[PDB]
């Protein structure tokens, strides 16, 4: 290759000669220590190089080299359960190699590990045409998670030769016949960071996700491939409703990314995470997880460039059909490695110190999670679902951060601290918290259901925008003022919030609801809810009722503990309910 | 052909080529990389045997020696067919829903020619959309600047759908067409209008423009200019009385900013680019009526409110400019009515020239006013309602607060789905008053019809 | 070395030519025509000349016979284990006139980034004997909290208590103070001299002053100094460390004055736009590593303008820094020592502190009921605010004294009063 020379030091710009081989935005070795690099001008044969690490200590005449290409990642076996920077720099292996706590300055290390053995299993036979995306064999990377070797893009013709066996990521595994002539392929292929990966199109989610949590799936859901944004107040049990999210969430992977955080609050998540158990298996997370993770004092660019590594890895394992959940947190802190940046190139200021483009940034960055037909002849389907939490950085809805991610998403789970002050976990709020995908999901709910689950769900959000009312009313004049309907309507608002709506994420039967179990549950309120109108109608007092329901009620509450398998009592609760509502009446 | 090796250097999205002979300013450029890929440019600013050029898509992965620009020698234009109708392109105009080829009659310079003007004409005649409070009461005429003036999610979508499939024009023997540029939008958003305009037969009578919210800016901010010129064509060239709708036009004014940063000209003085006003001007100085013409063009341009407090330069500027206004409301869509508009804060300025006698119905004036107050009562009975809580039931409030949310519910709530066509608007907001008694009527005579 | 080709000086900064092997951010001293030395660093190096900020100034050079001399390392301080007992100036050069003393090592001041994964979590509180701090907003060994406060608010004041104060119940070894003042008066730096003298605490802390009257760019380094002593002494050496720097205000003033003086565009309102960083690259040097004995806690003391509109913004750092501590003037006025506005300050890392075999455990849930209790209170005495006609009047009273009491009591526990977390939770029992 070319070897540059730096020709200009100040602060984080180094300016290297000699580098007309060289591209634009290139990833360069900058130095004798070789500390990570960018280019981002081009005069004649005169590079323009931002540095990532800092600068002190180096001077001119060091030399520079090119990696050949922008900032990308490695695809490929040994990716999972990995401890990643925004750089995809492995964390786990950086401590032993060098036997040091700190991230050393200028060290580089291979993303993956380019010299275990790993059993490729060819599933695909000799002289087939293939195209980019094809599936020529699978090699089982954890205990859950089949890994499949598939075409890298770029790559069309016949295959040659392809066997099984003991295979490092480095070593040939198969050959193919192109019209350039012969393509050795490896197990693991390359991709840039900020180039989104092709499909052969993109579709609508009309398919919601099973998240176990009862409010988000029952009033606000979330399809796959939809966009979730949650904003992360002090002690409001976010923490916890990601784990919740990440463990019992129908997909195959999970993707994690720390985009900047305080050090110890990232500590937590990564002792945390690998100690999450995966309920179908008994194993850990980890084992069908990728982890990438940023403190605050680290290098900017590694910091921006976070959330375009995961759903780069995201958009890898989507291609090979399966359904794919990738966290971010926090997208706030991202933004804020965007301003300091912009500054750092002297761009052009916008809303409140934020560049121009963030609003674009982040509409790049949330259209590229969808569901999708994966290139390929077998023409599979996979999905990218997206749950960002933005920091609200003061108490504040007018965030440009939190505007503009909201003009590109559907979901809003608004966490509020007023609630779990109160206990009520999640606290999520009814009101504020809304999804745009609850039409599209109620039609698919009932029919799957063969329910009118959509009318179940209108009415008990009915109820609760009742309530907020009522109880604003009862503030100005007292709880013995209102009907016996309207005070009806409260304490079946109670209901739905206490049952229904809270969880609790440590209990055993209640951290997961089962899609049937959900409509089984609401059933139960609403039918109370029913027969109790009907019977004030019929002429009974409010009093009555409430102590032959007294006895059933209990029944109610505690049936939201109660198993899957024995579901049979959560409907027989209809039963009973009727006979005794009827009973009361005479 | 004209393609020149020579880069002198590359700095973010601009780019620098020497030795070149025969550029002007804003010719278009394509670059060719090192590896095949194409890019358009535009060229910035030319001197000497040097020019300077903008890339839309980024310099990211050029190779500056082994690359080349290649000058197309003409500026950003519009290739314009009649067959253009029933077609979905994108932003630059190239097609997106694959389907034959488009062999134009010309090309068009996409800012356009400027009106002489004493020949525009004022705008006269009028457009039935098929939406109540737009038709009946805040009138919108051929060749008027009307906006619709929208909270984040209160049916703005839905409503700009429903006007494009049932806008139309009465008694006339000329052709009606319709052009939806989108700009800025989500994919999910433009997939809901496509698939909404293919079910209902109202591609037929179309043509429209996608700009994609994650499209290059200034895609973004070329698809009203081209949506415009498409609409002029048809309008003035091809006799038709065209309709232009842009969704979120505040997108657009995003999309300013970005570009003018990029660019390092005229620095914000307010926060958002210089001169975001003149170029709004500019857009809605094209819809009018050339006088000795039979087409037409009016545009709806939709765009979002400014939610009150983090408040921007976009409320003012289109406003200062415009003709009137129509408002949504979000208490309105919460409470169920749809589409909803808020009368009392919105007006067009323009009704009468469209609202008469023989183009739409006589009684279609006289009756606007009469009801229109008959509301702003309904909304006095909602003022004696507002401090009332539950204050003594008197006579004014009691029957006038009742006339209200009727209206709301059988007049504004048309149903979103619904074309309501004038004479039915008409019958049904005069029967709609006419359960309110005679003493408080403007028009003595025909007291039933 | 000795290169005397000087050919520019403007304003602080001078241009030296035909020199190589220059490193960015290198130090130079300067040798005047008169015998003077001066020290500065390399800002900026070209392909042969190279730029350079002289400290001290460029007051009396002449560039004819002036000389340059390139040492060819950067801003360095030299460690050792006899620094306790002991005063440095803003370069970590002795002020008191003691032994000379010989360093260990010379180590680079920047310090260097904790991998995520080797960084182990706080989980043992660190007992100020505060009332208003221990009880709540419970500081943890490692935690990065700090104080903001109005000038003339008692700021020092506290800082000084906490310092005399600041112990763990462990105890194997003790405690390790390491105090730097940045750009601050000397009467203000005289406050803290004395009491350490006074109260013995300088025998067992190690100190970097730097006043006002100091230059500038001085300040920038002192906080470096005293994070990478106490570095030295937390993980080389073992010890727990307590860091207190006073008012980063300042230290964030000189960012600007050097980014001024350096011709870097400002950042956002003003400043050099790469605060955010900046701080955090010092406040994030913190917590504890696994595999280590020793931690480094951080109690920054900052000034806060009463206004929002400006100085080191209290949320480009509150975020930054895991919780916070207000004093305010307001509170100041009515005999409350220290003055702890107890409504919006929290310690993001108080729940795992806290806990039986760390702490007594009636305190958890009694914080909570407390907390409850602060809410409550408020409600009964804070929030009417010279209303309440009715509200508080109608047997809340019981409200109705508890928080005036809490209010008076609890924040004023007097500066000099070392309260015991069991007594504190004691005087909360007393008020339950």
Same mark, same amino acid.
């Given at each position: 290759?070319?070897?540059?020379?730096?020709?200009?030091?100040?602060?984080?710009?180094?300016?290297?000669?000699?580098?007309?081989?060289?591209?634009?935005?290139?990833?360069?070795?900058?130095?004798?220590?070789?500390?990570?690099?960018?280019?981002?001008?081009?005069?004649?044969?005169?590079?323009?190089?931002?540095?990532?690490?800092?600068?002190?200590?180096?001077?001119?005449?060091?030399?520079?080299r090119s990696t050949g290409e922008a900032l990308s990642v490695e695809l490929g076996p040994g990716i999972i359960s990995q401890m990643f920077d925004g750089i995809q720099r492995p964390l786990d292996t950086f401590m032993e190699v060098t036997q040091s706590n700190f991230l050393g300055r200028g060290v580089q290390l291979p993303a993956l590990d380019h010299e275990k053995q790993?059993?490729?299993?060819?599933?695909?036979?000799?002289?087939?045409?293939?195209?980019?995306?094809?599936?020529?064999?699978?090699?089982?990377?954890?205990?859950?998670?089949?890994?499949?070797?598939?075409?890298?893009?770029?790559?069309?013709?016949?295959?040659?030769?392809?066997?099984?066996?003991?295979?490092?990521?480095?070593?040939?595994?198969?050959?193919?016949?192109?019209?350039?002539?012969?393509?050795?392929?490896?197990?693991?292929?390359?991709?840039?960071?900020?180039?989104?990966?092709?499909?052969?199109?993109?579709?609508?989610?009309?398919?919601?996700?099973?998240?176990?949590?009862?409010?988000?799936?029952?009033?606000?859901?979330?399809?796959?491939?939809?966009?979730?944004?949650?904003?992360?107040?002090?002690?409001?049990?976010?923490?916890?409703?990601?784990?919740?999210?990440?463990?019992?969430?129908?997909?195959?992977?999970?993707?994690?990314?720390?985009?900047?955080?305080?050090?110890?609050?990232?500590?937590?998540?990564?002792?945390?995470?690998?100690?999450?158990?995966?309920?179908?298996?008994?194993?850990?997370?980890?084992?069908?997880?990728?982890?990438?993770?940023?403190?605050?004092?680290?290098?900017?660019?590694?910091?921006?460039?976070?959330?375009?590594?995961?759903?780069?890895?995201?958009?890898?394992?989507?291609?090979?059909?399966?359904?794919?959940?990738?966290?971010?947190?926090?997208?706030?802190?991202?933004?804020?490695?965007?301003?300091?940046?912009?500054?750092?190139?002297?761009e052009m200021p916008g809303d409140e110190g934020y560049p121009a483009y963030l609003g674009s940034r982040l509409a790049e960055y949330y259209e590229r999670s969808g569901r999708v037909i994966a290139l390929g002849s077998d023409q599979r389907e996979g999905s990218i679902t997206a749950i960002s939490a933005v920091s609200p950085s003061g108490g504040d809805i007018s965030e440009?951060?939190?505007?503009?991610?909201?003009?590109?998403?559907?979901?809003?789970?608004?966490?509020?601290?007023?609630?779990?002050?109160?206990?009520?976990?999640?606290?999520?709020?009814?009101?504020?918290?809304?999804?745009?995908?609850?039409?599209?999901?109620?039609?698919?709910?009932?029919?799957?259901?063969?329910?009118?689950?959509?009318?179940?769900?209108?009415?008990?959000?009915?109820?609760?925008?009742?309530?907020?009312?009522?109880?604003?009313?009862?503030?100005?004049?007292?709880?013995?003022?209102?009907?016996?309907?309207?005070?009806?309507?409260?304490?079946?608002?109670?209901?739905?919030?206490?049952?229904?709506?809270?969880?609790?994420?440590?209990?055993?039967?209640?951290?997961?609801?089962?899609?049937?179990?959900?409509?089984?549950?609401?059933?139960?309120?609403?039918?109370?809810?029913?027969?109790?109108?009907?019977?004030?109608?019929?002429?009974?007092?409010?009093?009555?009722?409430?102590?032959?329901?007294?006895?059933?009620?209990?029944?109610?509450?505690?049936?939201?503990?109660?198993?899957?398998?024995?579901?049979?009592?959560?409907?027989?609760?209809?039963?009973?309910?009727?006979?005794?509502?009827?009973?009361?009446?005479? | 052909?004209?393609?020149?090796?020579?880069?002198?250097?590359?700095?973010?999205?601009?780019?620098?080529?020497?030795?070149?002979?025969?550029?002007?300013?804003?010719?278009?450029?394509?670059?060719?990389?090192?590896?095949?890929?194409?890019?358009?440019?535009?060229?910035?600013?030319?001197?000497?045997?040097?020019?300077?050029?903008?890339?839309?898509?980024?310099?990211?992965?050029?190779?500056?020696?082994?690359?080349?620009?290649?000058?197309?020698?003409?500026?950003?234009?519009?290739?314009?067919?009649?067959?253009?109708?029933?077609?979905?392109?994108?932003?630059?105009?190239?097609?997106?829903?694959?389907?034959?080829?488009?062999?134009?009659?010309?090309?068009?310079?996409?800012?356009?020619?400027?009106?002489?003007?004493?020949?525009?004409?004022?705008?006269?005649?009028?457009?039935?959309?098929?939406?109540?409070?737009?038709?009946?009461?805040?009138?919108?005429? %051929?060749?008027?600047?009307?906006?619709?003036? &929208?909270? !984040? @999610?209160?049916?703005?979508?839905? /409503? $700009?759908?429903?006007?494009? *499939?049932?806008?139309?024009?009465?008694?006339?023997?000329?052709?009606?067409?319709?052009?939806?540029?989108?700009?800025?939008?989500?994919?999910?958003?433009?997939?809901?209008?496509?698939?909404?305009?293919?079910?209902?037969?109202?591609?037929?009578?179309?043509?429209?423009?996608?700009?994609?919210?994650?499209?290059?800016?200034?895609?973004?901010?070329?698809?009203?200019?081209?949506?415009?010129?498409?609409?002029?064509?048809?309008?003035?060239?091809?006799?038709?009385?065209?309709?232009?709708?842009?969704?979120?036009?505040?997108?657009?004014?995003?999309?300013?900013?970005?570009?003018?940063?990029? %660019?390092?000209?005229?620095?914000?003085?307010? &926060?958002? !680019? @210089?001169?975001?006003?003149?170029? /709004? $001007?500019?857009?809605?100085? *094209?819809?009018?009526?050339?006088?000795?013409?039979?087409?037409?063009?009016?545009?709806?341009?939709?765009?979002?409110?400014?939610?009150?407090?983090?408040?921007?330069?976009?409320?003012?500027?289109?406003?200062?400019?415009?003709?009137?206004?129509?408002?949504?409301?979000?208490?309105?869509?919460?409470?169920?009515?749809?589409?909803?508009?808020?009368?009392?804060?919105?007006?067009?300025?323009?009704?009468?020239?469209?609202?008469?006698?023989?183009?739409?119905?006589?009684?279609?004036?006289?009756?606007?006013?009469?009801?229109?107050?008959?509301?702003?009562?309904?909304?006095?009975?909602?003022?004696?309602?507002?401090?009332?809580?539950?204050?003594?039931?008197?006579?004014?409030?009691?029957?006038?607060?009742?006339?209200?949310?009727?209206?709301?519910?059988?007049?504004?709530?048309?149903?979103?789905?619904?074309?309501?066509?004038?004479?039915?608007?008409?019958?049904?907001?005069?029967?709609?008053?006419?359960?309110?008694?005679?003493?408080?009527?403007?028009?003595?005579?025909?007291?039933?019809?």
């Amino acid at each position: 290759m070319q070897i540059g020379k730096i020709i200009k030091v100040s602060g984080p710009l180094v300016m290297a000669e000699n580098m007309s081989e060289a591209s634009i935005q290139d990833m360069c070795l900058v130095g004798d220590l070789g500390v990570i690099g960018e280019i981002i001008e081009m005069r004649q044969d005169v590079a323009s190089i931002q540095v990532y690490e800092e600068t002190s200590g180096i001077g001119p005449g060091e030399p520079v080299r090119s990696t050949g290409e922008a900032l990308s990642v490695e695809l490929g076996p040994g990716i999972i359960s990995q401890m990643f920077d925004g750089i995809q720099r492995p964390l786990d292996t950086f401590m032993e190699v060098t036997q040091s706590n700190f991230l050393g300055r200028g060290v580089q290390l291979p993303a993956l590990d380019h010299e275990k053995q790993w059993w490729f299993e060819a599933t695909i036979e000799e002289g087939t045409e293939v195209s980019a995306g094809d599936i020529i064999g699978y090699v089982d990377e954890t205990k859950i998670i089949q890994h499949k070797i598939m075409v890298p893009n770029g790559i069309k013709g016949t295959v040659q030769k392809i066997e099984s066996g003991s295979f490092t990521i480095d070593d040939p595994i198969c050959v193919i016949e192109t019209e350039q002539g012969l393509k050795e392929l490896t197990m693991m292929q390359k991709w840039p960071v900020r180039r989104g990966r092709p499909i052969k199109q993109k579709l609508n989610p009309d398919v919601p996700m099973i998240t176990g949590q009862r409010v988000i799936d029952t009033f606000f859901p979330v399809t796959k491939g939809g966009a979730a944004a949650v904003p992360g107040p002090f002690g409001a049990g976010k923490t916890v409703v990601q784990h919740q999210i990440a463990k019992w969430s129908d997909v195959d992977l999970v993707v994690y990314v720390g985009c900047g955080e305080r050090g110890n609050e990232m500590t937590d998540v990564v002792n945390e995470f690998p100690e999450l158990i995966d309920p179908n298996t008994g194993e850990s997370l980890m084992e069908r997880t990728v982890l990438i993770a940023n403190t605050s004092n680290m290098p900017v660019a590694a910091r921006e460039a976070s959330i375009y590594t995961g759903i780069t890895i995201a958009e890898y394992f989507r291609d090979m059909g399966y359904d794919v959940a990738i966290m971010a947190d926090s997208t706030s802190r991202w933004a804020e490695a965007l301003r300091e940046m912009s500054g750092r190139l002297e761009e052009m200021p916008g809303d409140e110190g934020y560049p121009a483009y963030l609003g674009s940034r982040l509409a790049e960055y949330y259209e590229r999670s969808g569901r999708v037909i994966a290139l390929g002849s077998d023409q599979r389907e996979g999905s990218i679902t997206a749950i960002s939490a933005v920091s609200p950085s003061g108490g504040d809805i007018s965030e440009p951060v939190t505007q503009n991610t909201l003009r590109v998403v559907k979901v809003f789970w608004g966490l509020d601290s007023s609630l779990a002050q109160k206990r009520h976990f999640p606290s999520i709020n009814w009101i504020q918290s809304y999804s745009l995908y609850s039409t599209e999901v109620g039609r698919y709910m009932d029919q799957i259901l063969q329910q009118d689950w959509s009318d179940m769900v209108t009415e008990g959000m009915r109820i609760l925008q009742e309530e907020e009312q009522l109880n604003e009313i009862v503030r100005l004049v007292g709880i013995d003022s209102l009907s016996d309907n309207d005070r009806l309507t409260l304490e079946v608002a109670k209901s739905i919030r206490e049952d229904y709506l809270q969880q609790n994420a440590f209990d055993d039967v209640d951290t997961f609801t089962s899609r049937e179990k959900q409509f089984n549950m609401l059933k139960v309120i609403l039918t109370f809810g029913k027969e109790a109108r009907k019977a004030l109608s019929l002429g009974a007092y409010f009093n009555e009722i409430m102590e032959g329901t007294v006895a059933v009620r209990e029944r109610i509450s505690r049936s939201k503990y109660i198993p899957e398998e024995e579901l049979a009592k959560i409907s027989s609760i209809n039963e009973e309910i009727k006979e005794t509502i009827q009973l009361i009446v005479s | 052909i004209k393609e020149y090796r020579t880069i002198k250097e590359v700095v973010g999205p601009l780019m620098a080529v020497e030795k070149v002979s025969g550029v002007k300013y804003e010719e278009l450029i394509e670059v060719r990389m090192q590896n095949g890929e194409i890019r358009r440019g535009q060229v910035l600013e030319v001197q000497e045997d040097k020019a300077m050029v903008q890339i839309f898509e980024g310099t990211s992965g050029i190779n500056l020696k082994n690359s080349s620009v290649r000058f197309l020698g003409h500026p950003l234009q519009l290739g314009v067919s009649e067959d253009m109708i029933g077609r979905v392109f994108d932003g630059l105009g190239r097609p997106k829903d694959n389907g034959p080829e488009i062999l134009p009659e010309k090309y068009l310079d996409i800012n356009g020619e400027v009106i002489n003007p004493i020949a525009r004409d004022y705008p006269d005649e009028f457009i039935q959309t098929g939406i109540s409070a737009i038709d009946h009461l805040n009138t919108l005429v %051929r060749g008027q600047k009307l906006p619709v003036f &929208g909270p !984040p @999610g209160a049916g703005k979508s839905a /409503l $700009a759908a429903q006007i494009a *499939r049932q806008a139309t024009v009465l008694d006339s023997s000329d052709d009606f067409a319709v052009v939806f540029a989108a700009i800025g939008i989500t994919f999910e958003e433009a997939e809901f209008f496509m698939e909404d305009f293919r079910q209902t037969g109202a591609i037929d009578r179309s043509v429209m423009f996608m700009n994609l919210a994650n499209d290059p800016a200034i895609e973004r901010i070329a698809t009203p200019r081209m949506a415009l010129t498409a609409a002029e064509y048809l309008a003035y060239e091809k006799g038709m009385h065209v309709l232009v709708i842009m969704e979120d036009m505040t997108n657009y004014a995003e999309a300013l900013r970005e570009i003018s940063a990029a %660019r390092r000209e005229v620095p914000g003085r307010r &926060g958002y !680019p @210089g001169y975001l006003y003149t170029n /709004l $001007a500019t857009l809605f100085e *094209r819809a009018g009526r050339i006088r000795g013409l039979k087409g037409s063009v009016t545009q709806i341009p939709i765009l979002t409110m400014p939610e009150d407090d983090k408040t921007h330069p976009i409320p003012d500027l289109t406003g200062y400019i415009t003709e009137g206004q129509i408002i949504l409301t979000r208490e309105l869509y919460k409470s169920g009515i749809s589409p909803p508009i808020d009368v009392l804060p919105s007006l067009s300025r323009l009704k009468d020239k469209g609202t008469g006698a023989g183009k739409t119905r006589e009684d279609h004036a006289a009756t606007m006013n009469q009801l229109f107050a008959a509301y702003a009562q309904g909304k006095q009975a909602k003022e004696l309602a507002v401090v009332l809580g539950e204050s003594a039931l008197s006579d004014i409030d009691k029957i006038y607060a009742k006339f209200a949310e009727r209206f709301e519910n059988e007049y504004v709530n048309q149903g979103f789905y619904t074309n309501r066509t004038i004479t039915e608007t008409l019958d049904l907001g005069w029967e709609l008053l006419a359960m309110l008694p005679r003493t408080e009527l403007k028009r003595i005579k025909d007291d039933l019809l």
